[PDB]
Symmetry: C3
Subunit: 622 residues, 3 copies
């Protein structure tokens, strides 16, 4: 039992009492909120040729504490808050696993109690670190996680629910030993870059105190890490031979600036086919997967050496240049708003649909409390069809759900208040070669302006890559390069996917997907600054297509007006138990609600829809 | 780009702007409705050893694009309209794929915009043809698809949404080059055969103009086709050896008229097992699947040669002869209506249940509008349990075949359903055993159970399936001669060329679903199939009328009742309860349904008079 | 069409008309309720090296046939009643399958008609018996299933729905020939042990009449059984060789009394790894699984021979001794009630949370509320997370075992739940560690949490699992001698013959579920299993009573509050909003549940006093 003090909060960490059969277990308590996290890792190697790691964060109360149970009454599935928290925990712990740890691993978070004051999502990240630290699963140093908010200009560590609602910043920082950063996830109300950068430095300082406390608990209880059967990494002898065979051919492919996505991959695949054939001959007894991974290591090394040595990217761009950006609005007449955003070979179609206010709340209390009503009546739906990458796939996706929330909070600060309709932005990825999620914010802002929503300002996002050269002995970063508007290959062979969105005068969202086991804080600051100048250029291009919201909504847009029905005719109009109202609203598409005993409010998505419902009302009234 | 004129309708086809990463892509626009269709096919052969093609039609908003539904995809799943459209698109494009194309193919439909006037489902079929034509996926000639309706006695191509509501016919025709019909799917309000035949002729002519427009776009684009890694067809020399080995054994089995479904299947399996081993020794290098498929080619060829040369089926009857038909009603006392229909070795148990009119609502706006409210408060649920074929399979969820077969039988029985019936009519058809057209048997059995239940339907409805066996030379590819078979068995559909299901009353046609496996068939074959099915439908209706010819004068005594109760407004607070909790509690415990009509009156629906009996007790026991 | 007379009830069994393609099919009718059951078994051995038997029970309607269920999504298989009924049928027929019958088998039940008077679930078990009897699927003897209830002190066979609503006992007995018992499932209203045991005796007598009727139809029809192409029992010569190689090593492991669950398994697995790499060399031609099952046969025999000959268990306990029991209460301040029950290495955390009476139990769609309501506003949820066994599992997806265990523990605690409680009582049982009867630990832990919440229950409920190890000659098949084990471990259940989970108060029996793995056990063994469990239950209740003996005088101060607030009729339009939008919004941002009582007042349920603080300032703000 080790206590950690963070300014004015307490973090009680304990182990050895509950769930003693799991490989690792821990209980993290702040105030009256307790979360127990367990870690289980199979001893046998996994058949899958990667690191199978799943994180499941389960809650029992929907609206924190207030709803008693969602699991007892509704087994229908996992909300988006549970999925998002699982992704944040997964991002914080995955980089610290050793390379080649091909073993099935599950991290489960069980919310023992919640007081409705201290949020359990932050304690769940720390619980995963403590459970993995005390376990025998091979894992690197402990990770501390805090949430930084800004209330009345002051930075608050782990703000309560009451303060979180009044905060202009919602930033979560996961830090490694030596003040490294392994996870960043923020949503801000268009705050300045200077305020945003200060909060990151404050957060990393607080996570070091948690790491010191966890290391103390690891010292008290004897922790002996297991020895895995074998770590699945290609042998240096095989990797060296692959470098001799295919360095020149791979170098020529990556120095050929005429390649597109499909031709670059085909050229690399042709080298892979030839090299793997002679690799098996040289090593007849080698693992078949070891041949595949050895080529991927050599190809990644060759790709990264060009950026570091020559400052030239595989498509001929320099470190700061953007890809070609094309914008378009008013694609189809019947849509309330539309926009087609193109960035290199990434195409995104964004649509804006207006709906009734009542569409937010559905199906009694528990269902509408599992997924709470959005603060402003505005949600974003993200789709990643299989053909976006020329693929076959079945049509709950974790990546697509997470990207939708990332783009939704990027556009959230500029959405106006008290809009007379629900705003539903649908972002569809038609072609994928880069940051389609960031293109959803740019295209979503264009479609919002085209639909007539009076947003405060345009929102643009970009992804910043990173290529580093780490010393094999010290482990420190000798030198690094930051890339603007990375491709798919640069993200695949890079060290991070630093997606950040915002307006021209502020920052609205950030999601750093760091693949390295921690990066220095100054690299994060330079990534924010590099993306600041890249965002200005993108907003310059988008403003040429459209610079301000349209004066009025489209003529074929939704209408809302009241209809008066007498007391005598209400029985016939509503029908037996509201059957007539439910029948009319189901075929003509309108939504009718009673505001009082006399007047009803009718919402029709199109003027034609209201025309049908208007004659239907009058014929009953006569 | 390329525009095609269809009467007063204008069609636009374009490509090269959206989804450029897919193997094929196209945008088909009619009016303000735009649909984008993509085709993706893998280059590595799939281990499934068949055609893994899957079509997923998707709509972003229900109720003619008025109520968005894309966001609740997680909590809703796929609607029935989307599944039915996917089956129609699959039927139109599957027969044109080359034989042995065992590569994972998926076709996606993305409704870019819908204006609530032009239906996007027909444009989706056309988009699938253009996307495949422009792609490098090996696919035969383009397919045009139109919808034909009959409004005020005139034939309309691609009618608007408000035009099909007043239409007596809803027919979708997919055509291949040279006026060959690929897919047929219709649902008419008991229209004459001559009117039905004329609409098909008009539709095929309209699809030819679409094909001509698509071919122009293909030539302009400059499409080149990939060379597949391998086409998994058996070697001609392997089939020649297999034919010599099992020609006589298979001939004797198919000429034995004492066989049933099970005994015939195990008889050909005995020859297959013996031939399998001998083929392996002769051709050790041959693939394990190549040996299996070669026997299937020989068995299919021997099976068809008997029909073509001798005009006799495997079970001994002639081309126009039906199998034994037996009917029975009122087997169980407590069922509102019931019927047991037997045709050959196919047995279907049909049950009729009367529910409240409020059961058609799903209590929430979006989900209710996703599938809509039934037109006559009539629905049909079709169940195909695994024991119908002596098989083991999961029963969770609803597969696409069950959904499609339920809508087909529902469309067959829809025109005769009366209007303003005081209850929701639910028909459940369970295939107890399957050897033939169970979906058509659900139409016949459903009609019998509807009359037994006491619903005053206009006329009895019967449905039959028509097979087809054609001889085609590989040199050219046109049909030389053909045989049309009445009431085909499972082996005759499996080894046949089409599954021509059609139902109707004695003086009209109500539903049709042609499932053609050939790459198009002449229109004259379709006309003959409709005529041959009308004769068989008359024979089946003759047998059914002996069991029951008119609906019962009234519903069964144990049937549902509707009553109106009076509660004073002061009493309403404690009778209804806090938030209606008392009413909801009485609903689940007893089974009755109470709906407020006005301030004092409450309408009560009880499935049984006994269930009603314990409902007035609750009303009076208060105070 | 053989008819069987069971007192005043008539049972009609027919075959040969419907579903003739299936391997076996039968129709069982009682009154106006008819149930058709089919059985299909594949003739090709399954790749999975066990018996893949699945039973699916489907009802076309809910609320005893009043509400049609099909026409809806969520198929038909998944439902509270349907999953439990499938579990009852599965346990009635599973023990009678031959050993080594690794063939895919499915049993399906279709409710042809339901009259709302006779229960189709009992007919479904008999239908599964007839369908398997008439099929060519190798099955060992028909079984008969009856339901026994006590209505006015008299015992009623197959009670109607009206009689079950007034019955103090809900017992289902499945009997094999020669008066054996295959399945027991009871839900008693805290009845006396002598009355409970008499009902079992009466039930077994009635099942013998059904077996007599089924056997008449089998001979009349002329059933002939198939010959499976292979039975996967290990060869006698390999099993005897594994015995000579691992008997001494396994004997030392099971006589080592300092082993725990994990250490014992690793010690056994060490012997398995060393023995298997010697059996393969001795029999290079042996099937790979035949080696695996040969070691399992030897290990199971050695484990059972110790308790038979020495009366000593693997952990040093005697036959009637319990494991260590530890209990804690109110470990977390914010929970309405909590308890941490520990039994040996089995650890269960139980939580009690109150709910709004109305919105809690009533679902959104009144049609979708097929399991409409619990008689008392009380239900239990059982969770078996994968880390309870140090495993990785599907955290989602339907779990039949989890559903069955939740209803079993809920049945145990139901008779002591008070009536007309202001809130919906929801008990959560989470198995943090599992080494035995976590289901019965949920009964004891749930009892402690209920008293800690202030719920005035009548008495404390304790449960226990009784195992059994028998000696049976292979020449004939009778039981010579046997041992009954109190509070069995996981290994004792795995290598045992029966998992006799029974719960009750200190003066009665509330629930029972006998998981008999043998092809029937004598009525005598069941009698002493109940008596032995009575002694163990009293010992457990004394340990729990030390932690807490009576319910708290009041609920926790941070518990739910229900009180009304007056809303003027002139302000009703603005407060409720357009079509109840404002009430839905307020009830979603906060946990407060608002229900309109009359035209001027609204009843407000608040989960916490702070929740009503937020709600009160929200409504008063509207008043301006």
């Amino acid at each position: 039992a080790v206590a950690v003090d963070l300014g004015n909060r307490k973090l009680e960490i304990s182990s050895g009492k509950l769930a003693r059969f799991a490989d690792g277990s821990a209980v993290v308590q702040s105030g009256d909120t307790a979360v127990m996290v367990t870690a289980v890792s199979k001893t046998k190697p996994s058949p899958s040729q990667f690191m199978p790691l799943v994180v499941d964060y389960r809650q029992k109360a929907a609206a924190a504490g207030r709803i008693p149970t969602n699991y007892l009454r509704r087994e229908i599935g996992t909300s988006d808050k549970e999925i998002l928290t699982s992704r944040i925990i997964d991002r914080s712990i995955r980089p610290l696993f050793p390379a080649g740890y091909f073993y099935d691993t599950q991290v489960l978070c069980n919310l023992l109690a919640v007081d409705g004051v201290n949020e359990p999502d932050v304690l769940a990240i720390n619980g995963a670190s403590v459970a993995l630290s005390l376990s025998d699963i091979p894992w690197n140093g402990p990770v501390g996680a805090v949430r930084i908010g800004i209330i009345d200009g002051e930075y608050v560590v782990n703000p309560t629910r009451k303060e979180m609602s009044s905060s202009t910043l919602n930033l979560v920082v996961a830090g490694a030993p030596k003040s490294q950063i392994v996870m960043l996830e923020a949503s801000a109300e268009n705050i300045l870059q200077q305020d945003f950068c200060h909060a990151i430095k404050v957060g990393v300082k607080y996570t070091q105190q948690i790491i010191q406390g966890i290391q103390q608990l690891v010292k008290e209880t004897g922790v002996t890490k297991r020895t895995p059967q074998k770590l699945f990494t290609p042998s240096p002898e095989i990797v060296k031979y692959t470098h001799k065979l295919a360095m020149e051919r791979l170098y020529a492919v990556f120095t050929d600036y005429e390649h597109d996505k499909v031709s670059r991959d085909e050229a690399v695949n042709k080298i892979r086919l030839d090299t793997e054939e002679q690799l098996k001959e040289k090593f007849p007894e080698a693992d078949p997967y070891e041949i595949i991974e050895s080529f991927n290591v050599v190809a990644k090394e060759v790709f990264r050496s060009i950026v570091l040595n020559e400052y030239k990217r595989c498509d001929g761009r320099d470190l700061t240049s953007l890809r070609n950006v094309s914008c378009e609005v008013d694609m189809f007449k019947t849509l309330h708003g539309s926009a087609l955003f193109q960035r290199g070979q990434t195409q995104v179609l964004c649509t804006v649909t207006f709906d009734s206010l009542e569409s937010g709340i559905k199906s009694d209390q528990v269902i509408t409390a599992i997924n709470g009503i959005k603060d402003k009546n505005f949600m974003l739906h993200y789709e990643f069809p299989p053909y976006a990458t020329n693929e076959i796939g079945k049509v709950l996706n974790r990546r697509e759900l997470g990207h939708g929330a990332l783009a939704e909070k990027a556009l959230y600060p500029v959405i106006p208040r008290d809009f007379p309709f629900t705003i539903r932005v649908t972002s569809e990825v038609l072609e994928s070669n880069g940051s389609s999620s960031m293109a959803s914010a740019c295209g979503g802002s264009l479609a919002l302006m085209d639909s007539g929503v009076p947003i405060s300002s345009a929102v643009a996002g970009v992804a910043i890559g990173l290529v580093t050269k780490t010393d094999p002995e010290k482990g420190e970063i000798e030198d690094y390069r930051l890339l603007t508007d990375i491709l798919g290959i640069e993200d695949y062979n890079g060290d991070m996917d630093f997606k950040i969105a915002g307006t021209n005068k502020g920052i609205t969202a950030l999601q750093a997907d760091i693949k390295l086991p921690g990066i220095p804080i100054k690299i994060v600051m330079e990534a924010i600054q590099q993306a600041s100048v890249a965002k200005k250029e993108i907003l310059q291009i988008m403003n040429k297509t459209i610079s301000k919201p349209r004066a009025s909504r489209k003529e074929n847009g939704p209408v809302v007006e009241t209809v008066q029905v007498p007391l005598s005719k209400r029985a016939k109009f509503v029908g037996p138990g509201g059957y007539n109202l439910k029948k009319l609203q189901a075929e003509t598409g309108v939504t009718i609600s009673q505001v009082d005993e006399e007047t009803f409010s009718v919402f029709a998505p199109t003027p034609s829809a209201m025309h049908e419902a208007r004659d239907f009302i009058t014929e009953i009234c006569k």
